[PDB]
Design a protein around this nucleic acid. Structure first.
Ligand SMILES: [Zn+2]
Ligand SMILES: [Zn+2]
Lengths: 69, 95, 72, 54, 120, 79, 100
RNA sequence: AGGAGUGGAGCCUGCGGCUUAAUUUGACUCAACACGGGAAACCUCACCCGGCCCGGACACGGACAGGAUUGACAGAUUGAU
RNA sequence: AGCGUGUCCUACGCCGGCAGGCGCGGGUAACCCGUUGAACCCCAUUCGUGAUGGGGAUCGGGGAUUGCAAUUAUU
């Protein structure tokens, strides 16, 4: 229906490279795969997601003290 | 230090009675000694040697060395470069 | 801070000492009793040091020290 | 060694600028091309022509 | 395995100047700017250790300091020791790594386990 | 291609600040007390005020002929 | 034919004395002049921390320099132009002449 | 007398602590704590793990032009041409 | 609007949703950006007391720039 490609929520997918908009039951079914990729392939950011610490390179000295006892 | 570089440095200081350099050991060419490919480090370390023997006096200010020939320097570079005794630095020829 | 003196390394590196070869000019020219000479070292065809500078007779290549030119 | 002695790039950043008086690399005034550090400008300001008015 | 719907069989055949349409923007830009001598010398070393190895056996480690290196398909199967600052850590190139950098897979710090609070 | 006047009026005070420092470390033991710069279009004059005027030029004037040659090399004056 | 004389200084007293002398000389000879027009003052500001070590009560020095400009226009040959300027010389005044 | 607040929340930045190979360092009431122009990817950089260079003047003694010394291709080695 | 900067500050035209790209021009400046068309302000619309279209932390995919190098996300 002539909707441009830059408007979706997964544009150039890693595994199949298709421009698709994922929705309620699929949007969370393509996030767990994204994190499992980086946990199985031991990337730094996948280990951060594993330990529960922060991901985008933040200052953890002062902020973020909720959840931690 | 190549002998050609050492000669070039010594016979430039002889025409004047003075020498100027910048404290910059990574400058690849001394501006007064261009087209001879004499680095700035070599000038610094040659005037360091001539000072220790007493033939020149230095003055440092704001990253710059200013060296002057002494009466024992004209007497010593005249024999090193085999110059005729009818050669005198430009400082000694006026007034 | 405070100085901590850790000098431990895989022993100590040794600086390359050059070998003192006596009269290396001899081996370049073969001189008989008749006066004629033979040039035992192959020579480099260059401009910086041609006509007098001999190359290196290695086991698989000829090499000029000044030119850094290698013929295999 | 000649290939790698002073071979890191020095085109930008604090590692490429320094005081024109004392060669320090911290607190430099680049404005108007003064190129004097924070503490050397308070020493030569009157000589340069700066006046404290207000 | 497949990258954007293209598997390793053709990825090894894809032209270096043609991989820039499968990577993301950062690595497309780096490939466009160019790989330098230190990158080519590491690729050449990884190639030599791959060819001069038994067929059914892993290659020999090629250690490098270059943490900022794109992991090309030509690197797949290599045994690489990445320097974290003090020690070289052994990292093997798994296919799904063909996007990331090398230094991401050798952590430069120790995970923090806290002890008894002291003065404060 | 010339320079902005903001940068020109500044660069004329940085030049005069280093010349005073250089002459201070050079002629202090001879009564150095100040310098003045007169930019005549043909010839740039530099007046040095001092107590012992004989110890500034020196015998035969062999000292102020050294200064006038070491200053132009530093500051890129034409001969 | 048009001769633009630009004056620039930091001491307004000296600069105005020079400008008045030039205008008076041009009146003294048979010349037509365009009066001194004053460009906006140029104020250069450097603000610095007083301390060399960042310890005290965070005081600041406010430094500044002021540049004064004028413009004068003449309709005369360069021979006539180059007498009055050579008569009056003052330190700190940057006299510039442009022929059209 | 009042106004806007701070102290509560999320985050950004500095101090302790705790970790760390190192998480370089100065400053601790007003008169330390977005201060050291201190917003550090490299440089800055001091800190940590490694690896080249001397840029050790000058004086004296030794060896040495039947050479004091200097630099260098390739194989190996090396993070590295 | 006002105080300031500018040999990096940029007008004009074309492709881009945009961030952003290509070709000509001006300015060492009351001369060009620039008559500096700033934001709150102001006038119409939708929303309707609710953890709500308030508020934006956090995180996943893409794209583009600075740089030799952006992976412990530079922006
Ligand atoms: Zn040769
Ligand atoms: Zn300084």
């Amino acid at each position: 229906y002539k909707i441009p490609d830059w408007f979706l929520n997964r544009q150039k997918d890693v595994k199949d490279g298709k421009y698709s908009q994922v929705l309620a039951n699929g949007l969370d079914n393509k996030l767990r795969e994204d994190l499992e990729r980086l946990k199985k392939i031991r990337a730094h950011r996948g280990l951060r997601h594993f330990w529960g610490l922060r991901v985008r390179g933040q200052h953890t000295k002062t902020t973020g003290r909720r959840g931690r006892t | 230090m190549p002998k050609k570089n050492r000669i070039a440095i010594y016979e430039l200081l002889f025409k004047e009675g003075v020498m100027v350099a910048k404290k910059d050991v990574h400058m690849p060419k001394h501006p007064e000694l261009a087209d001879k490919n004499v680095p700035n480090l070599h000038v610094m370390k040659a005037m360091q040697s001539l000072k220790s023997r007493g033939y020149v006096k230095e003055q440092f200010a704001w990253r710059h060395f200013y060296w002057y020939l002494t009466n024992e320097g004209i007497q010593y570079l005249r024999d090193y470069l085999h110059l005729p005794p009818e050669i005198v630095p430009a400082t000694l020829r006026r007034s | 801070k405070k100085r901590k003196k850790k000098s431990c390394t895989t022993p100590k590196k040794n600086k390359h000492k050059r070998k003192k070869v006596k009269l290396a000019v001899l081996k370049y020219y073969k001189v008989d009793e008749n006066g004629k000479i033979s040039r035992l070292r192959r020579e480099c065809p260059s401009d910086e040091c041609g006509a007098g500078v001999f190359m290196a007779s290695h086991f698989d290549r000829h090499y000029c020290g000044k030119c850094c030119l290698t013929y295999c | 060694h000649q290939q790698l002695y002073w071979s890191h790039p020095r085109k930008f950043g604090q590692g490429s600028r320094s005081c024109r008086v004392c060669s320090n690399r911290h607190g430099l005034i680049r404005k108007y091309g003064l190129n004097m550090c924070r503490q050397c400008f308070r020493q030569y300001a009157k000589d340069i022509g700066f006046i404290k008015l207000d | 395995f497949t990258y954007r719907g293209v598997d390793l069989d053709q990825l090894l055949d894809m032209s270096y100047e043609q991989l820039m349409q499968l990577y993301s923007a950062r690595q497309r830009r780096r490939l466009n700017r160019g790989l330098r001598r230190k990158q080519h010398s590491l690729l050449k070393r990884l190639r030599k250790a791959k060819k001069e190895a038994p067929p059914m056996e892993k290659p020999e480690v090629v250690k490098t300091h270059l943490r900022d290196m794109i992991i090309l398909p030509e690197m797949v199967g290599s045994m690489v020791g990445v320097y974290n600052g003090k020690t070289f850590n052994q990292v093997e190139i798994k296919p799904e790594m063909i996007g990331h950098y090398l230094g991401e897979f050798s952590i430069t710090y120790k995970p923090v386990k806290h002890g008894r609070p002291g003065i404060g | 291609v010339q320079i902005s006047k903001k940068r020109k009026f500044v660069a004329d005070g940085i030049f005069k600040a280093e010349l005073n420092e250089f002459l201070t470390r050079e002629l202090a033991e001879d009564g150095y007390s100040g310098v003045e710069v007169r930019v005549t279009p043909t010839r740039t004059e530099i007046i040095i005020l001092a107590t012992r005027t004989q110890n500034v030029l020196g015998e035969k004037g062999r000292r102020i002929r050294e200064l006038t040659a070491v200053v132009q090399k530093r500051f890129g004056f034409p001969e | 034919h048009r001769i633009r004389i630009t004056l620039t200084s930091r001491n307004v007293k000296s600069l105005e004395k020079v400008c008045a002398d030039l205008i008076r000389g041009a009146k003294e000879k048979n010349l037509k002049v365009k009066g001194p027009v004053r460009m906006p003052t140029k104020t250069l500001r450097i603000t610095t921390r007083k301390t060399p070590c960042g310890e005290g009560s965070k005081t600041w020095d406010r430094f500044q320099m002021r540049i004064h400009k004028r413009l004068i226009d003449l309709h005369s040959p360069s021979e006539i132009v180059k007498q009055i300027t050579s008569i009056s010389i003052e330190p700190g005044v940057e006299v510039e002449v442009t022929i059209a």
